[PDB]
């Protein structure tokens, strides 16, 4: 299956951030801190929320995103985690891993163990007022249990929307190999908006990890 790299929906270092503090093609918000090699979406301070979203919408029948990130913090517990998004609108701040509680599209949530370790796929058609704590278990379309914190190498999520199936593959941070992925979850017959923004958001609470995204690479898939 053919992949075309879509620069207008992507970011990576080196020199990720412009001299003016912006990241080409994206908007950062909240407590997100662009730096040369990564964007620290939510730092290890109390009650943080941040995000990075594409400034334009993509209209890809099929697509794939490769997101490389780290979630780093003290102890065996941390919070909150991060979310990868494809939604009709350009997301704004809220209580769902730093983003708003309603959306039209899909979120893939990486929820840190704070005593569930989980990666969860959650759809929304614009009608659900989502509260992760209350609704995650019941509304998850699919999930897997992986611990993505404090790993030796960057964690890599590959989220593919191809032939109406949304698949989540994960490299859980034990190899530097940008292509060594294992299956996490898939959702068949997923309907998502024909056009939408890509995004990534994170948050902290009383417990707080540093949530860093090193790169977000978007590909348009063809057949």
Curated annotation (Swiss-Prot):
Residues annotated to bind Ca(2+) 1: 111, 113, 115, 135
Domain L-type lectin-like span(s) in chain numbering: 3-221
Positions of disulphide bridges: 144-184
Domain of life the protein comes from: Eukaryota
Chain sites annotated for binding a carbohydrate: 47, 80, 115, 132, 205-207
Keywords: Disulfide bond, Endoplasmic reticulum, ER-Golgi transport, Golgi apparatus, Lectin, Membrane, Metal-binding, Phosphoprotein, Protein transport, Signal, Transmembrane, Transmembrane helix, Transport
GO biological process, one term: positive regulation of organelle organization
List of residues binding Ca(2+) 2: 114, 116, 135
A single GO molecular function term of this UniProt record: identical protein binding
GO annotations of cellular component type: COPII-coated ER to Golgi transport vesicle; endoplasmic reticulum; endoplasmic reticulum membrane; endoplasmic reticulum-Golgi intermediate compartment; endoplasmic reticulum-Golgi intermediate compartment membrane; glutamatergic synapse; Golgi apparatus; Golgi membrane
UniProt subcellular location: Endoplasmic reticulum-Golgi intermediate compartment membrane; Golgi apparatus membrane; Endoplasmic reticulum membrane
Quaternary structure and interacting proteins, as annotated: Exists both as a covalent disulfide-linked homohexamer, and a complex of three disulfide-linked dimers non-covalently kept together. Interacts with MCFD2. May interact with TMEM115. Interacts with RAB3GAP1 and RAB3GAP2. Interacts with UBXN6. Interacts with SERPINA1/alpha1-antitrypsin. Interacts with BET1.
Protein purpose: Mannose-specific lectin. May recognize sugar residues of glycoproteins, glycolipids, or glycosylphosphatidyl inositol anchors and may be involved in the sorting or recycling of proteins, lipids, or both. The LMAN1-MCFD2 complex forms a specific cargo receptor for the ER-to-Golgi transport of selected proteins.
Name of the protein described by the UniProt record: Protein ERGIC-53
Region of the whole protein represented: 50 to 277 of 517
